[PDB]
Amino acid sequence: MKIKKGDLVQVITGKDKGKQGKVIAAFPREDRVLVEGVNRVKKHTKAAGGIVTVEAPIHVSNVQLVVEKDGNKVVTRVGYRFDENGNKIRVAKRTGEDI
Amino acid sequence: NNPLKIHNLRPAPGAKTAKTRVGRGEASKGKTAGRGTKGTKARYQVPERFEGGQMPLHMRLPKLKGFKNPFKTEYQVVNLDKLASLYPEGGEVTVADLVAKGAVRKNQLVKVLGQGEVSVALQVTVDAVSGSAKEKITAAGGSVTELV
Amino acid sequence: STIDILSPAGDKAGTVELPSEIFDAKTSVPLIHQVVVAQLAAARQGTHKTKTRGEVRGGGKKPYRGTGRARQGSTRAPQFAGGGVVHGPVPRDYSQRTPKKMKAAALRGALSDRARHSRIHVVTGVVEGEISTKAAKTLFGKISERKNLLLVVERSDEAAWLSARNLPQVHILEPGQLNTYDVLVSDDVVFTKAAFESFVS
RNA sequence: GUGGCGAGCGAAACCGGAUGAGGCCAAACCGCGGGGUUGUGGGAUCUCUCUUACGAGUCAGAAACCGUUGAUGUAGGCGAAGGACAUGCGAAAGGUCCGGCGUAGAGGGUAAGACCCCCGUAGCUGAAACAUUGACGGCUCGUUUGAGAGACACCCAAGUAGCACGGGGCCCGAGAAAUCCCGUGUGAAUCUGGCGGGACCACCCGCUAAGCCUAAAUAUUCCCUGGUGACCGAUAGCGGAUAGUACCGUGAGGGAAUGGUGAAAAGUACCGCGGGAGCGGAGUGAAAUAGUACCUGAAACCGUGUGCCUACAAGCCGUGGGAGCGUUCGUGACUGCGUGCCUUUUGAAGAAUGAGCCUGCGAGUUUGCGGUGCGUUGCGAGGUUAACCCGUGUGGGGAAGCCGUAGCGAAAGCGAGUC
């Protein structure tokens, strides 16, 4: 699971394309994440019982990290690299920078 | 143009014959599948060596005469007519050379036989020869040298 | 007939004579058909089996005896639900014994057919120096734009194998295992000069 | 060849292949140890002549362990390259345009067909720990007089071989029956010894029984890792989409049936009738005759509405002619003809058998260098491989064999002839 908890991602394929958002909670076993703002469902719950609007998980392969390059934002894939002590650090590939 | 592609292959006409699927429908080899009704042959096979109780063919005629020789050897034989076409100019005729001309099996005893005529001289070196063949070879100026 | 050798860049690098006995032999469709059908049949794995009324688990008892029902000898008879299969499949090898001369003649016919339409090509190499799927892609684009291509190269030439194996449309073979099915499927045949001499000899 | 010479059974020599390996004891003789190991016979014992460090190991020729180090295994890591516009409906992986990687276009998922979204693949990379297995060092073991000539007849596996009887197995079913094994009696010899070469004898040829050890080619998959399928896809495939459970039997034992909402529960808030169930609005959803009884939803079967006919008529229920009515089509007043289906029978509507109905399942298959005939294809006085070997595949090699090439005769044998 490259998508850590608490990252800025962009929905690339879904009802809501474009929308960025933070990663609320990640489920690395069923390969889904919660991005605040997207797939906000209206649960009909009874008893304060009533319509409640909260976001449902989206597939991990439907989001992708947002790295800032030359002003505006740009979606990028993520690779790894050891620094000196065999420590993998998430490295952006669109920019070659360190995310 | 449009060369041979693997979906252009077709068998020679009459090569493949469609199977005969008995037991499907009544406008074909129908319910009985070409057997008739209720006999030993409507469900089973009748062996060939069985004449309905009457003494079988193979059991009322006497055994064949005589014994057999466990050590009889048969020669591969070459008639003069077909030996005068392998050597249309004469010469020596060895056994191992006759094998290479497809006239006798490998690893056996050769015996030239006397059918036909020989017009050229042959020096045959074989395991045996018949009387008429020997005369015909010698008449044509050849010599016959037996190994056995 | 003579065909031009292409250098790895696509330039002419000489000429070669197609041996008539190999590349100008008679093409007999019935002969080619048998060999090709034999090839595809021999490729069948044939691992497939079912359980007859003897191997189904249970059913050793006679289900019952004036009962007024049908007479049954076992609960695993063919007509019963869950009973054994009658005349079902069994494992078997589908390979066919085809005479050696028919196989060789068919390959000669297939290659001769391609030659007659001018679809045999020869190259001194596929890639010069480093392994590059791009170099092979450019070379084959120069040779032909057709869908199916067959590349005959010695197995000791890793450069050509590794460079060209990933291309979707290219099927690779050793000179010694050139076979009828691959020739017919492929629109063009491309030999490496080392491969061509190895095959003809 | 064998066989109530019936049904059947059925070698060997030798040929081509896979693998390839040889060691040690008993006896005599000397004090459990030495000794010695043979088919060209060898060994002992006595006389004479000459002469007088090295190798093998974890094994069948003995047997362990200690360490150093190499490889493989049991967790893993990295691993290239896609955007825009519109549509879609709800979702772009599909449409159009331009691109990129490729030692990676295997495969799986992602809200519909993805090489570039994810997991991966090509390609590299990795082990504190323990296992498997190499190499080395330590270590252990074996040998350290030998050869020739002559003597001598001392030893060379005993209740055994052979023989008699009764049996078993070998192509051989007890036969003239060899070899091999068993029980009962009788019962040797030691190299001038003995055994076999299909009764038996002689000669000739091979070989040393009554002691032992021995890897490789060979058979198998409960189990583990990775894969494949012109294999199944919920009455199929294992009995089991987990069940040897439920249930049956005292007991050994027998032994089932039940998979599917949607991309996501967003699984229907709220309102009303009702005890509840359930339903009508409403809402979510792309879709609610997708509402947890849920994808698609056939037939038998059961209903509502509707067009036509039907209460003076005898009907294998149909078919020809035909008026009328009506949301070509639907119905069919009246009239002509007309005794079901299958099986089995000389002959069945038959009062002869089988079928209540629908749906699904259920009977000519497979093997073989088998036998035979036909068609076709390749080669053609030749044709062709089997086992097996090499290779990723279907490709190449492999002539051991088999069929054709001369037949007749009981056979010797002769041979276009032969009896």
Side-chain angles (χ1 to χ4, degrees):
Chain A
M1 261 305 268
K2 285 142 161 193
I3 308 314
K4 186 180 289 293
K5 171 186 76 61
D7 313 328
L8 183 63
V9 299
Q10 183 178 2
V11 185
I12 62 170
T13 181
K15 193 155 272 206
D16 291 331
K17 290 176 70 68
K19 274 173 81 93
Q20 280 72 359
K22 195 53 91 203
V23 165
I24 288 304
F27 306 128
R29 214 211 301 291
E30 191 145 70
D31 277 334
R32 324 191 91 90
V33 287
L34 294 174
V35 168
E36 91 191 350
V38 298
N39 263 17
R40 54 172 41 250
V41 295
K42 297 183 289 294
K43 296 184 289 294
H44 312 337
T45 82
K46 65 179 72 66
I51 317 305
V52 168
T53 292
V54 184
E55 69 275 16
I58 198 174
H59 204 281
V60 63
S61 87
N62 284 19
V63 306
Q64 185 178 2
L65 281 73
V66 175
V67 65
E68 302 305 10
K69 185 212 62 193
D70 291 331
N72 73 103
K73 325 163 91 173
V74 65
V75 74
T76 188
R77 317 186 277 111
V78 164
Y80 292 165
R81 93 161 200 280
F82 314 83
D83 61 357
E84 291 186 40
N85 306 90
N87 307 134
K88 315 203 312 294
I89 318 174
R90 284 210 273 117
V91 164
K93 292 177 71 67
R94 184 71 101 191
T95 63
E97 281 256 0
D98 213 317
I99 190 166
Chain B
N1 184 86
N2 314 67
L4 206 70
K5 265 302 181 83
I6 209 164
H7 69 88
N8 264 357
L9 311 189
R10 54 201 321 141
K16 295 333 181 53
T17 301
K19 214 160 157 76
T20 284
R21 285 231 312 291
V22 299
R24 323 302 182 181
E26 192 66 49
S28 168
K29 304 262 201 143
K31 84 186 196 318
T32 61
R35 299 197 107 168
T37 81
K38 64 178 73 175
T40 291
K41 294 142 81 53
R43 283 142 200 131
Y44 284 118
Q45 295 293 321
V46 169
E48 294 293 328
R49 84 302 190 281
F50 170 74
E51 293 179 353
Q54 154 198 12
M55 208 58 157
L57 261 182
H58 67 271
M59 188 180 290
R60 66 184 183 272
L61 323 180
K63 291 182 180 180
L64 271 193
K65 204 152 71 143
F67 68 93
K68 274 183 321 303
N69 201 10
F71 301 122
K72 183 178 184 293
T73 71
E74 291 216 310
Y75 309 82
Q76 291 291 310
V77 302
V78 194
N79 298 300
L80 282 193
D81 63 358
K82 204 152 161 193
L83 174 45
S85 307
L86 294 174
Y87 300 84
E89 181 146 30
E92 171 145 30
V93 166
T94 61
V95 176
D97 189 358
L98 261 183
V99 175
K101 274 152 211 203
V104 293
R105 313 209 161 291
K106 44 192 161 83
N107 304 346
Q108 322 274 330
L109 295 174
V110 185
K111 185 176 180 180
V112 192
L113 295 175
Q115 190 214 70
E117 71 286 330
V118 65
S119 66
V120 298
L122 292 78
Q123 293 104 60
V124 298
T125 308
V126 295
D127 282 306
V129 65
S130 67
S132 58
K134 192 171 186 169
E135 189 276 331
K136 287 185 178 190
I137 297 169
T138 300
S143 65
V144 178
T145 61
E146 293 179 353
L147 294 174
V148 183
Chain C
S1 47
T2 44
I3 62 170
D4 291 331
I5 296 169
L6 300 174
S7 74
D11 291 331
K12 194 192 271 223
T15 300
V16 298
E17 181 46 2
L18 296 178
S20 57
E21 69 275 16
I22 300 177
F23 296 97
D24 203 350
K26 64 172 201 163
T27 62
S28 178
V29 178
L31 175 61
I32 297 169
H33 177 270
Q34 182 177 347
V35 174
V36 169
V37 171
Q39 293 204 260
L40 291 175
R44 276 190 81 208
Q45 191 179 4
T47 61
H48 60 87
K49 184 182 191 273
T50 71
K51 295 213 181 163
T52 67
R53 66 177 292 180
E55 279 169 19
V56 176
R57 184 176 177 87
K61 164 182 41 53
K62 188 179 177 77
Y64 42 84
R65 299 188 228 172
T67 60
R69 294 151 261 201
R71 284 191 261 281
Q72 322 284 20
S74 179
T75 56
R76 306 303 184 180
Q79 82 254 30
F80 276 74
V85 181
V86 55
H87 307 310
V90 293
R92 64 160 141 180
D93 197 57
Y94 285 101
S95 66
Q96 294 179 357
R97 284 151 50 79
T98 300
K100 293 183 180 181
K101 294 183 161 103
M102 283 161 82
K103 296 182 181 183
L107 180 60
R108 272 151 189 52
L111 288 171
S112 300
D113 186 74
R114 292 294 179 262
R116 274 181 211 90
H117 293 86
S118 306
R119 298 190 182 192
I120 317 304
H121 307 279
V122 184
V123 297
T124 51
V126 183
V127 298
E128 61 186 20
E130 282 285 39
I131 298 95
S132 181
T133 308
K134 275 152 281 303
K137 186 179 180 179
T138 307
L139 176 65
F140 297 140
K142 294 172 171 343
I143 278 170
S144 184
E145 62 295 340
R146 305 179 231 181
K147 285 187 175 181
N148 299 320
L149 183 63
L150 188 154
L151 180 65
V152 187
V153 298
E154 293 179 353
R155 185 179 67 189
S156 51
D157 186 74
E158 271 75 0
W161 282 70
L162 293 173
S163 299
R165 73 192 220 181
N166 198 55
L167 291 203
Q169 284 313 359
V170 176
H171 190 71
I172 297 169
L173 294 174
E174 292 180 0
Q177 293 179 356
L178 190 67
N179 66 75
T180 300
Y181 179 77
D182 295 319
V183 174
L184 286 169
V185 172
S186 304
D187 291 315
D188 291 331
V189 184
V190 184
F191 290 88
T192 301
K193 196 167 184 37
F196 182 82
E197 299 196 46
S198 182
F199 179 73
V200 173
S201 58

